Amino acid sequence: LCSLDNGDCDQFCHEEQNSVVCSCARGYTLADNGKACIPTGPYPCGKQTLE
């Protein structure tokens, strides 16, 4: 599960009732696919700046 390629999660991975549940850092929202994490606004945490 989470031990298998982070459960396919972009960020946080937790195993609940034998299932993988993804979540994200403050400032991100879990995408519709429940794995990807989408930045809530400009300069989200953890991203090197490009402009």
Partner: protein
């Protein structure tokens, strides 16, 4: 930082620098949010009054992205002990909010369990700062970064002349001439995961810098996530 490379434009935006009355940096910090800086508790015992600078990469040329911020309140860990560097973590709340821009952005705080099993088991983490470039050399004028491999807990406990508490972890090389150093203290130790950097440590201490058979010791941030969370709302 001994060895390593300099942080290129926009590469270490979470780096903050604690500066004394004479505008000289004496410790590092990590931008956690618009109002909070994470640093080493032992750094507070290094200067009476200080401010925090962000967006700096070359202390010898005002590039324009730099911003100095006054500290509203200092939050030292109640259990910090100067003798052993245990509980070496402190949070700072700034009087004014940091405006994120090029070279000024926060690092993500990870979840303890996931970070310990997934982040801290990665090959390396990244440490950075304006600290000395050699154990007896002068402080760096350019912000530097260094990839430091995580070091086996037991190999590290064995290598150290001082106690390695449960609030510490090690990173670096056994003999290779690369390591953090004086000046980088309080600075960021982060781990990259899928192009997103999470704070995993606070430059804490070491015996000299880049010494053979000696490693870099960092505050185990994952052990203080609940603490940081509380401090960032007080």
């Amino acid at each position: 930082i001994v060895g390593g490379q300099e942080c290129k434009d926009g590469e270490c935006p979470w780096q903050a620098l604690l500066i004394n009355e004479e505008n000289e940096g004496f410790c590092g910090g990590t931008i956690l949010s618009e109002f909070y800086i994470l640093t080493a508790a032992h750094c507070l015992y290094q200067a009476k009054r200080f401010k925090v600078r962000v967006g700096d990469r070359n202390t010898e040329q005002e590039e324009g992205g730099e911003a100095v911020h006054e500290v509203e309140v200092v939050i030292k860990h109640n259990r910090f002990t100067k003798e052993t560097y245990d509980f070496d973590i402190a949070v700072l709340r700034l009087k004014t909010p940091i405006t994120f821009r090029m070279n000024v952005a926060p690092a993500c705080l990870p979840e303890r369990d996931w970070a310990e099993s997934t982040l801290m088991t990665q090959k390396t983490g990244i440490v950075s700062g304006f600290g000395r470039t050699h154990e007896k050399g002068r402080q760096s004028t350019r912000l530097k970064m260094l990839e430091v491999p995580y070091v086996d807990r037991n190999s590290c406990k064995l290598s150290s002349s001082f106690i390695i508490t449960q609030n510490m972890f090690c990173a670096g090389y056994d003999t290779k001439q690369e390591d953090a150093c004086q000046g980088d203290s309080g600075g960021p130790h982060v781990t990259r995961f899928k192009d997103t950097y999470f704070v995993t440590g606070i430059v804490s201490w070491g015996e000299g810098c880049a010494r053979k058979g000696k490693y870099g010791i960092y505050t185990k941030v994952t052990a203080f996530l609940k603490w940081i969370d509380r401090s960032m709302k007080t």
